[PDB]
Amino acid sequence: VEKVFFVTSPIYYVNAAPHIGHVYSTLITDVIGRYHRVKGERVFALTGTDEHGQKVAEAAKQKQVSPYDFTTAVAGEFKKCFEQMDYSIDYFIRTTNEQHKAVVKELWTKLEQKGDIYLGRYEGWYSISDESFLTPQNITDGVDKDGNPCKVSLESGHVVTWVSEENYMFRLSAFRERLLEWYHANPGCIVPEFRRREVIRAVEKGLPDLSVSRARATLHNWAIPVPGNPDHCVYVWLDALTNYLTGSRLRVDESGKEVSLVDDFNELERFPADVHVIGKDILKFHAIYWPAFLLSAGLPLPKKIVAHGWWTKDRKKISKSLGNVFDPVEKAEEFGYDALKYFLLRESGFSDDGDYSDKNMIARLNGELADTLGNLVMRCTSAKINVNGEWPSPAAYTEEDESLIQLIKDLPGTADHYYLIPDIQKAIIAVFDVLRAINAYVTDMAPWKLVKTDPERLRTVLYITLEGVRVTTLLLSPILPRKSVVIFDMLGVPEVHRKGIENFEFGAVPPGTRLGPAVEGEVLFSKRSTE
Ligand code: MET
């Protein structure tokens, strides 16, 4: 199936300003998208904002402002932040969009016509802040904003409230067996593996039916009305999840503005998502509810859901009220955009709750980006070493030459598999393992001495080094999109050879290609003061 590769981030609540969690999720989405574009594939990468619900409307009220104005402003803060982060996302969706509402109504009607929605009751706990229904086993005792006894979510720690309401219910219980068939038949469909096992164990135990509407009053009328019943509003999560379907059906103009909603998803060849990127906090919605809605509606299911962990800073929770902030724009202005991206993607795997510190950030910047990558680029482009400023024609390869060539040839296959899991950390580590071997080869060969001693031998060492740098940089370009261009410029790699699987091959750039011009004080990654 040749198709548009469709990758998504969650759409974020607009109750507060964007922070590291949103930036991270969208980064991962962006990297996956970029990698597939460099493979030469059609890509549609989607992100946005989740703007309805009690959470958002009550946040708007605290600030004493209309929900229309509040959501528009905060959505604007998200757009600005992502523009500043220099992502390459194809569309930013908002759930207040009029075409999104039409798609939600359409999906609801499908579910209803399928016979999977009935009028019932929910009587139980609810976390407004997570917009999540909870069983008694998922709450415990805690303290409220006044310091008084209350109940709180075991999963999030936020305050829970008891809801008793006549609600439209989705027959989620009837999808147990089909969901288990889906997990078993596609054992790569949830990453990482231990989260897949978590989902299966939960669904094995049994699923209750799910409330998919609420009384309009309790939502402060900030939601999508239920088709055919104006007293009810659609559950914010059914509304939210549907953004993936809406996005798959929007034709977007050059300005990034939506201009048209197609009737059928096949028209645009995006749906279903190849990868949904999410935080672990919202796994049940994506791995249980969403596929259940899709099965009911007769829509195809996503290929992969990847769920990552939560960041801390200096081994403590990130929080403004606690005095431990982590502003990614600020840190990117301080250490560099590509460098911060690298750190976030290298420091932690999706299994882990990563930790940022300035100490570790500086260590990775100095050790990997500067000492390993940058130093190598300067060596093979130095006029002291590469005296003719060009890709030389290699002479015969020794066994040591060939062991390195083999590593370079194997790298694209290895990195590719890792990018497709996806496991971005392992893709990076694999590339840097090859960079370290190129460095050690260079140190071993001492090309600087070969200038005087054996110019022929130098041609060989230089060519292998240049090509190793080109291939590694190509595979890092989704992670260091700005710096990869600087490197290719320095190497004089023609535009055409900067993407496409043809250029994963060793030897794509011919001997005789000239290096890019030099600039006196130019430095690729400047080391930062250790303190
Ligand atoms: C359909 S993804 C919705 C995610 C939700 N708005 C959140 O921030 O957790």
XYZ file of C-alpha atoms and ligand atoms in Angstrom:
540
model
C 0.000 0.000 0.000
C 1.594 3.226 -1.289
C 0.079 5.898 0.817
C 0.799 9.218 2.502
C 2.767 8.462 5.656
C 0.530 9.909 8.380
C 2.025 10.773 11.758
C 0.300 12.650 14.603
C 0.946 14.200 17.982
C -1.703 14.484 20.645
C -3.796 17.654 20.441
C -3.178 19.550 23.661
C -5.546 21.113 26.213
C -5.373 24.920 26.104
C -5.962 25.493 29.827
C -2.354 26.690 30.158
C 0.660 27.875 28.167
C 2.727 25.353 26.201
C 5.534 23.612 28.107
C 8.171 20.882 27.650
C 5.715 17.964 27.497
C 3.920 19.410 24.460
C 7.214 20.388 22.823
C 8.622 16.850 23.312
C 5.587 15.054 21.884
C 5.480 17.305 18.845
C 9.261 16.947 18.418
C 8.928 13.154 18.187
C 6.108 13.525 15.699
C 8.263 15.946 13.721
C 11.330 13.702 13.692
C 9.353 10.677 12.479
C 7.813 12.836 9.746
C 11.183 14.247 8.713
C 12.798 10.821 8.470
C 10.144 9.609 6.033
C 10.483 12.752 3.907
C 14.236 12.076 3.632
C 13.372 8.551 2.478
C 11.456 10.373 -0.318
C 7.976 9.476 0.919
C 4.847 11.618 1.005
C 4.258 12.722 4.614
C 1.474 14.449 6.506
C 2.376 15.404 10.064
C -0.365 16.658 12.332
C -0.484 18.461 15.666
C -2.889 20.835 17.412
C -5.072 21.886 20.322
C -7.968 20.283 22.199
C -10.165 23.265 23.031
C -13.496 22.038 24.396
C -14.543 20.580 27.708
C -15.054 21.501 31.335
C -11.323 21.663 32.014
C -10.739 24.315 29.326
C -13.954 26.264 30.026
C -13.241 26.408 33.759
C -9.694 27.571 33.048
C -11.246 30.334 30.884
C -13.524 31.333 33.740
C -10.651 31.548 36.270
C -9.072 34.128 33.925
C -12.507 35.831 33.605
C -12.616 35.774 29.781
C -14.864 34.205 27.096
C -13.980 30.660 26.051
C -13.754 31.825 22.421
C -11.134 34.467 23.255
C -9.305 32.299 25.808
C -8.851 29.306 23.481
C -7.896 31.497 20.537
C -5.162 33.240 22.553
C -3.706 30.037 24.017
C -3.891 28.210 20.705
C -1.895 31.199 19.396
C 0.723 30.605 22.113
C 1.024 26.988 20.979
C 1.415 27.953 17.293
C 4.056 30.541 18.102
C 5.968 28.102 20.306
C 6.027 25.420 17.602
C 7.072 27.980 14.969
C 9.891 29.030 17.278
C 10.893 25.375 17.753
C 11.370 25.103 13.997
C 9.297 22.005 13.384
C 8.086 20.912 9.956
C 4.483 20.042 10.829
C 1.995 20.070 7.912
C -1.111 21.181 9.760
C -2.125 22.571 13.122
C -5.688 21.522 13.974
C -8.082 23.126 16.457
C -11.181 21.314 17.731
C -13.192 24.563 17.510
C -12.780 24.288 13.722
C -16.164 24.109 11.989
C -15.085 21.232 9.686
C -13.893 19.234 12.697
C -17.365 19.566 14.218
C -18.989 18.161 11.065
C -16.682 15.117 11.172
C -17.438 14.499 14.871
C -21.181 14.607 14.130
C -20.683 12.247 11.210
C -18.737 9.768 13.340
C -21.270 9.932 16.166
C -24.094 9.162 13.738
C -22.134 6.170 12.404
C -21.669 4.766 15.906
C -25.348 5.331 16.632
C -26.536 3.732 13.377
C -24.269 0.760 14.117
C -26.289 0.288 17.327
C -23.354 0.959 19.679
C -24.748 4.043 21.436
C -27.628 3.951 23.929
C -29.057 6.260 26.558
C -27.832 5.162 29.986
C -26.287 6.496 33.208
C -22.837 7.014 34.580
C -22.570 7.078 38.360
C -18.933 7.185 39.379
C -15.719 9.105 39.775
C -14.374 11.567 37.201
C -11.171 13.601 36.927
C -12.036 16.901 35.263
C -8.352 17.679 34.741
C -7.691 14.432 32.865
C -11.303 14.386 31.505
C -11.253 10.763 32.614
C -13.681 8.285 34.132
C -12.210 6.315 37.010
C -13.254 3.273 39.055
C -12.953 3.305 42.878
C -9.733 1.265 42.540
C -8.172 4.224 40.722
C -8.717 6.909 43.347
C -7.339 7.451 46.818
C -7.310 10.074 49.556
C -5.578 13.412 49.107
C -5.791 17.146 49.688
C -7.492 19.910 47.663
C -6.390 23.471 46.766
C -7.759 24.599 50.192
C -5.865 21.945 52.192
C -9.058 19.947 52.893
C -9.614 16.174 52.563
C -10.815 14.994 49.161
C -10.352 12.182 46.694
C -7.718 12.229 43.953
C -6.759 10.150 40.939
C -4.159 7.436 41.578
C -2.874 7.941 38.021
C -2.546 11.753 38.022
C -3.048 13.075 41.567
C -5.703 15.602 40.447
C -8.988 16.024 42.308
C -11.859 13.660 41.429
C -15.573 14.325 41.668
C -18.564 12.020 41.782
C -20.746 12.243 38.672
C -24.308 10.923 38.449
C -25.877 11.751 35.098
C -28.061 10.382 32.387
C -25.492 10.019 29.546
C -25.284 8.442 26.100
C -23.131 5.322 26.462
C -20.859 3.637 23.903
C -20.954 -0.203 24.088
C -17.229 -0.540 24.785
C -17.778 -3.816 26.651
C -18.803 -5.474 23.361
C -15.380 -4.742 21.802
C -13.234 -6.741 24.215
C -12.758 -9.754 21.954
C -12.049 -7.735 18.789
C -9.556 -5.505 20.621
C -7.697 -8.571 21.905
C -7.646 -10.014 18.346
C -6.184 -6.721 17.129
C -3.378 -6.589 19.744
C -2.466 -10.249 19.159
C -2.477 -9.968 15.364
C -0.322 -6.839 15.391
C 2.183 -7.292 18.223
C 4.117 -4.221 17.014
C 1.092 -1.919 17.214
C 1.888 -0.466 20.657
C 5.396 0.670 21.622
C 7.208 0.172 23.935
C 6.427 -3.434 24.601
C 5.684 -3.178 28.327
C 2.925 -0.634 27.584
C 1.461 -3.031 25.054
C 1.352 -5.686 27.763
C -0.311 -3.156 30.106
C -3.063 -2.506 27.580
C -3.698 -6.214 26.954
C -3.866 -7.045 30.695
C -6.373 -4.236 31.243
C -8.622 -5.307 28.373
C -8.413 -8.996 29.372
C -9.984 -8.081 32.735
C -13.123 -6.731 31.023
C -14.298 -3.319 29.839
C -17.285 -1.312 31.044
C -19.402 0.770 28.689
C -18.197 4.338 28.249
C -20.130 7.565 28.638
C -19.770 9.552 25.404
C -22.006 12.507 26.290
C -22.573 14.822 29.251
C -25.407 17.113 30.373
C -24.856 20.461 28.661
C -24.901 22.534 31.884
C -21.972 20.712 33.468
C -19.869 21.501 30.357
C -20.834 25.196 30.552
C -22.045 24.721 26.952
C -18.466 24.608 25.678
C -18.577 21.467 23.551
C -20.143 19.895 20.453
C -23.865 19.155 20.730
C -24.978 15.549 20.315
C -26.724 15.142 16.935
C -30.462 14.985 17.509
C -30.241 15.796 21.242
C -29.430 19.454 22.127
C -29.433 18.711 25.895
C -26.235 16.624 25.558
C -22.701 17.463 24.485
C -20.205 15.032 22.992
C -17.530 13.661 25.365
C -14.451 15.815 24.898
C -12.354 12.702 24.225
C -14.519 11.378 21.385
C -14.368 14.954 20.032
C -10.591 15.053 20.559
C -9.745 11.630 19.095
C -11.688 12.478 15.988
C -9.071 15.188 15.159
C -6.985 12.422 13.585
C -9.861 11.647 11.143
C -10.633 15.322 10.475
C -6.932 16.005 9.755
C -6.774 13.107 7.334
C -9.596 14.786 5.376
C -8.472 18.447 5.196
C -6.874 19.902 2.065
C -4.382 22.505 3.286
C -3.188 25.545 1.229
C 0.369 26.963 1.012
C -0.252 29.208 4.034
C -1.116 26.126 6.165
C -4.782 27.165 6.190
C -7.462 24.502 5.798
C -9.488 25.160 2.650
C -11.642 22.059 2.172
C -13.048 18.969 3.875
C -13.248 15.889 1.617
C -16.163 13.448 2.043
C -14.132 10.265 2.264
C -10.683 9.725 3.827
C -9.457 7.586 0.871
C -9.448 10.786 -1.173
C -6.320 12.076 0.611
C -4.666 8.699 1.345
C -3.631 9.555 4.899
C -6.040 7.731 7.164
C -5.308 5.685 9.241
C -2.287 6.982 11.097
C 0.913 5.076 10.620
C 2.095 6.435 13.992
C 0.164 8.153 16.781
C 2.698 9.780 19.129
C 1.407 10.102 22.723
C 2.423 10.437 26.360
C 1.835 7.433 28.636
C -0.872 9.423 30.476
C -3.256 9.028 27.492
C -2.701 5.414 26.437
C -6.188 4.091 27.300
C -7.870 6.672 25.060
C -5.669 5.742 22.069
C -5.189 1.962 22.513
C -8.631 1.019 23.878
C -11.330 3.668 23.130
C -10.117 4.916 19.733
C -9.763 1.506 18.045
C -13.119 0.546 19.534
C -14.792 3.645 17.978
C -13.088 2.864 14.653
C -14.218 -0.790 14.666
C -17.762 0.346 15.400
C -17.655 2.878 12.563
C -15.991 0.442 10.181
C -12.875 2.601 9.827
C -9.358 1.174 9.572
C -7.133 1.109 12.651
C -3.830 2.898 13.237
C -0.638 0.928 12.554
C 1.352 2.058 15.591
C 0.845 3.948 18.856
C 4.074 5.041 20.556
C 3.816 6.219 24.154
C 6.714 8.016 25.799
C 7.445 9.010 29.439
C 7.484 12.254 31.459
C 10.436 14.625 31.966
C 11.849 15.825 35.282
C 14.466 18.553 35.804
C 17.340 17.991 38.241
C 15.545 14.818 39.452
C 12.502 16.862 40.558
C 9.074 17.609 39.105
C 8.881 20.447 36.605
C 6.518 23.102 38.028
C 6.225 26.910 38.171
C 4.577 26.860 41.616
C 7.435 24.704 42.995
C 10.218 26.782 41.395
C 11.615 24.248 38.943
C 10.983 25.524 35.419
C 12.176 24.021 32.159
C 11.534 26.416 29.291
C 12.676 24.709 26.081
C 12.757 27.905 23.986
C 14.977 29.498 26.653
C 17.296 26.467 26.747
C 17.407 26.364 22.925
C 18.408 30.048 22.819
C 21.153 29.141 25.337
C 22.494 25.857 23.873
C 21.046 25.753 20.344
C 17.899 24.383 18.759
C 19.329 21.307 17.070
C 21.422 20.603 20.215
C 18.429 20.700 22.591
C 16.480 18.465 20.210
C 19.363 16.040 20.123
C 19.548 16.015 23.902
C 15.827 15.350 24.417
C 15.907 12.507 21.888
C 19.252 11.014 22.967
C 18.987 11.296 26.747
C 15.846 9.194 27.152
C 14.091 6.291 25.505
C 10.307 6.007 25.315
C 10.381 3.491 28.183
C 11.895 6.114 30.475
C 11.019 9.250 32.344
C 13.989 11.314 31.152
C 15.838 13.885 33.281
C 17.262 17.236 32.110
C 20.158 19.009 33.810
C 22.460 21.734 32.442
C 25.377 19.508 33.461
C 24.256 16.562 31.346
C 23.146 18.841 28.513
C 26.637 20.371 28.374
C 28.276 16.918 28.558
C 26.308 15.617 25.553
C 26.843 18.847 23.605
C 30.616 18.805 24.259
C 31.131 15.031 24.105
C 28.967 13.969 21.189
C 28.087 16.995 19.105
C 31.323 18.942 19.478
C 34.046 16.335 20.188
C 32.638 13.509 18.049
C 30.588 15.017 15.202
C 31.911 18.585 14.882
C 35.577 17.695 15.314
C 35.240 15.035 12.591
C 33.655 17.454 10.090
C 36.430 19.984 10.684
C 39.131 17.330 10.215
C 37.971 16.060 6.823
C 37.319 19.593 5.491
C 40.462 21.225 6.915
C 42.700 22.813 4.277
C 45.651 21.521 6.303
C 44.455 17.944 5.640
C 42.221 18.182 2.582
C 44.675 20.390 0.697
C 42.662 20.490 -2.564
C 39.267 21.186 -0.946
C 37.546 18.250 -2.617
C 36.407 14.634 -2.469
C 39.486 12.709 -3.490
C 39.569 9.595 -5.575
C 40.387 6.631 -3.302
C 43.225 4.184 -3.920
C 43.069 0.507 -2.881
C 41.362 -0.289 0.409
C 43.150 -2.086 3.266
C 41.316 -4.437 5.625
C 40.985 -1.675 8.206
C 39.527 0.604 5.489
C 37.010 -2.092 4.674
C 35.906 -2.843 8.215
C 34.906 0.824 8.431
C 33.286 0.887 5.006
C 31.220 -2.098 6.101
C 30.017 -0.251 9.203
C 28.978 2.690 7.022
C 27.162 0.410 4.550
C 25.245 -1.390 7.286
C 24.222 1.802 9.102
C 21.224 2.874 6.957
C 19.496 -0.521 7.328
C 20.025 -0.443 11.091
C 18.940 3.176 11.566
C 15.913 2.594 9.322
C 14.610 -0.286 11.423
C 15.020 1.800 14.576
C 13.234 4.793 13.024
C 10.326 2.492 12.082
C 9.721 0.894 15.501
C 9.982 3.843 16.321
C 12.910 4.065 18.716
C 14.685 7.333 18.021
C 17.180 6.967 20.835
C 18.523 3.719 19.346
C 18.720 5.239 15.877
C 20.865 8.068 17.272
C 23.090 5.742 19.277
C 23.623 3.587 16.164
C 24.703 6.598 14.100
C 27.061 7.836 16.789
C 28.620 4.359 17.177
C 29.589 4.736 13.533
C 30.837 8.306 14.070
C 33.060 7.116 16.947
C 34.542 4.395 14.706
C 35.281 6.958 11.993
C 37.024 9.104 14.583
C 39.118 6.216 15.821
C 40.007 5.339 12.212
C 41.101 8.943 11.618
C 43.233 8.979 14.788
C 44.741 5.670 13.763
C 45.518 6.849 10.222
C 46.745 10.338 11.265
C 45.905 11.884 7.868
C 47.650 15.103 8.886
C 51.028 13.302 8.690
C 50.049 11.556 5.433
C 49.979 14.932 3.624
C 53.799 14.904 3.532
C 54.363 11.154 3.883
C 51.892 9.362 1.538
C 49.515 11.566 -0.511
C 48.064 8.476 -2.216
C 47.145 6.840 1.100
C 45.630 10.161 2.209
C 43.217 10.128 -0.768
C 41.793 6.859 0.529
C 41.536 7.873 4.190
C 39.952 11.211 3.242
C 37.404 9.724 0.905
C 36.205 7.115 3.453
C 36.028 9.785 6.148
C 34.053 12.216 3.961
C 31.580 9.559 2.957
C 31.123 8.271 6.504
C 30.352 11.851 7.583
C 27.889 12.292 4.709
C 25.981 9.070 5.430
C 25.861 9.552 9.216
C 24.725 13.164 8.708
C 21.988 12.105 6.297
C 20.579 9.740 8.924
C 20.906 12.414 11.618
C 19.209 15.070 9.494
C 15.761 14.390 11.036
C 17.351 15.144 14.442
C 19.657 18.025 13.456
C 17.807 19.556 10.484
C 19.636 22.920 10.511
C 23.088 21.586 11.348
C 22.836 18.775 8.798
C 22.508 21.439 6.075
C 25.566 23.281 7.386
C 27.525 20.039 7.290
C 26.361 19.141 3.760
C 27.277 22.708 2.682
C 30.754 22.334 4.181
C 31.109 18.988 2.401
C 29.814 20.453 -0.862
C 27.149 17.733 -1.143
C 24.810 18.662 -3.998
C 21.154 19.237 -3.042
C 19.976 16.163 -4.898
C 22.156 13.886 -2.758
C 20.742 15.230 0.543
C 17.698 12.927 0.460
C 16.290 9.751 -1.049
C 17.198 6.130 -0.323
C 19.500 6.181 -3.356
C 21.766 8.348 -1.209
C 21.793 5.943 1.733
C 24.285 4.047 -0.455
C 28.024 4.330 0.100
C 29.610 6.189 -2.789
C 26.734 8.461 -3.878
C 28.954 11.533 -4.086
C 31.614 11.321 -6.775
C 35.333 11.974 -6.389
C 36.061 15.490 -7.649
C 33.099 17.114 -5.885
C 34.373 20.397 -4.418
C 33.987 21.310 -0.753
C 31.918 24.319 0.200
C 33.748 27.544 0.918
C 35.382 28.073 4.313
C 34.595 30.908 6.743
C 37.389 32.093 9.093
C 35.900 31.579 12.579
C 33.137 29.121 11.636
C 32.410 26.444 14.230
C 29.694 23.800 13.994
C 29.108 23.211 17.717
C 31.013 25.465 20.101
C 31.802 23.869 23.463
C 30.151 25.395 26.536
C 31.814 26.195 29.861
C 31.690 23.259 32.308
C 30.514 24.417 35.779
C -6.719 13.173 20.999
S -5.258 13.515 21.965
C -5.954 14.538 23.302
C -4.992 14.793 24.446
C -5.495 15.709 25.582
N -5.985 17.025 25.073
C -4.336 15.966 26.528
O -3.742 17.045 26.559
O -3.968 15.072 27.275
